[PDB]
Ligand SMILES: O=Cc1cc2ccccc2[nH]1
């Protein structure tokens with residue numbers, strides 16, 4: 001029993017983190033096969049930060065201008081190119097620790113593990129979710145550019161996120177591993193507002209199912225509700241609408257607990273309208289929305 | 303910015319996890335140099351669970367009765383011995399991935415990362431703390447026996463915990479890597495009460511300092527307090543007493559924020575007596591006590 005915000009084991013990703021320096025800027029890079037991936041921020045300086053001319057900055061760079069270090073081992077760059085917001089540095093040595101991997105672009109509401117790195121050295125690992133406004137509420141310091149997010153599916157690493165910048169509000173924005181930003185963000189030092197964030201409804205319902213599985217049952221009421229009636233209440237409290245796709249994905253949890261999805265919606269409906277009255281669910285006084293239905297099944301039943 | 307319950311990178315520990323089977327029981331093991339460490343629970347069956355005679359059970363075992371598998375590789379056992387509650391299985395092959403390591407016994411209030419493993423395969427990693435009653439609030443399923451807790455200090459893995467059992471209350475108990483249980487627990491299937499748990503005061507204060515560093519300042523009041531007056535209030539709300547050793551360890555955070563430790567105590571004093579009024583600190587509606595002063599410095603300033 002028990003329930004934690006667990007992250008995937010990071011060993012397969014640790015063996016791929018390198019340090020990338022071009023001129024005077026240093027950040028993290030991802031070394032897969034004979035290619036190092038890193039944000040194109042590495043070819044910038046302070047002066048150009050308001051609106052960098054990335055093409056002109058890269059035209060003036062040679063392969064030798066890129067210093068790539070795997071631990072204490074210098075990798076020789078034998079070619080370079082830019083794809084959207086990331087650079088591909090071709091090196092003469094293939095990473096012997098390359099895991100089976102895929103590049104994926106995730107949807108809002110899905111979760112992934114973040115390996116926070118500095119100077120190519122992993123510092124820590126944590127679990128987070130892609131918010132509906134395409135930001136993440138991570139923990140990054142200066143020098144964390146190039147840190148990657150990922151999921152692990154039975155020895156296959158699915159890379160989904162590379163870290164770029166921190167917004168004035170304290171949230172974070174990044175790209176997929178093909179260089180495209182999640183959300184309407186650009187790698188320039190200009191004020192960029194994130195959209196209004198909402199709560200991931202299907203994740204809260206999955207988290208309530210995990211509570212029932214681990215013995216927290218006080219919030220379950222005796223009522224049911226329709227899908228339309230539930231979505232009307234969810235709209236008032238800034239929750240995402242619940243779709244039949246979401247009801248379908250909650251099926252296995254419903255079968256394990258015997259609680260129909262619309263019955264759990266009736267219980268969430270009361271929680272939204274009346275609050276917790278100082279009580280907690282799985283050790284939290286707030287409703288958690290960073291556990292997918294898949295995350296709940298994995299932790300509650302391997 | 304941002305603040306997460308971060309765990310250490312697990313790669314150095316993943317390379318040491320093996321599967322240990324003796325007879326019909328299977329659990330996890332820790333493979334360091336030419337020795338595999340695992341709970342002595344592996345030589346038990348259902349019948350003997352109420353009060354296992356561990357010495358008699360081990361006397362009837364040969365080296366060949368122990369099946370140790372590192373991935374798909376079978377390790378040959380060439381010797382065995384029992385030290386307290388763990389077994390040492392000497393194998394003919396040294397683990398080529400053995401990191402620099404130490405065996406440590408931690409104190410209550412200190413934190414460590416847990417690598418949850420099943421059949422010798424890491425499943426996830428999370429951060430937790432040794433409670434004052436010597437339990438941990440982890441997340442384990444059946445088959446998690448032998449999972450280890452650890453800290454990483456610049457390439458040196460300090461192993462501090464090996465998982466054994468789950469109490470009827472849903473909390474977890476284990477041993478150090480020399481086989482001695484944390485707290486008054488025995489590896490038998492008998493009802494064993496944990497002592498009344500308390501809140502780790504110095505960790506809450508460190509977590510409040512992390513809030514100030516990341517911009518949450520609403521709880522800071524205009525008052526100060528003495529150490530004796532603070533401990534009187536902390537006693538009423540089941541908080542550990544604050545010692546001068548704790549005041550000393552909070553020094554660096556006080557210097558960074560300019561807030562004297564006794565001033566932050568005055569602010570915690572008001573929070574304990576009046577509550578949060580529905581507001582949150584670092585995204586939580588409860589006071590968190592699983593971040594040490596060392597954890598806060600690492601995440602807020604690498
Ligand atoms: O990857 C690092 C990085 C990208 C970026 C864009 C704007 C401002 C700071 C930034 N850092």
Ligand SMILES: O=Cc1cc2ccccc2[nH]1
Pocket residue numbers: 329341343446447448465466467468488489490491
């Ligand atoms: O390590 C696994 C393990 C030890 C133990 C003791 C009592 C009951 C169950 C147990 N599992």
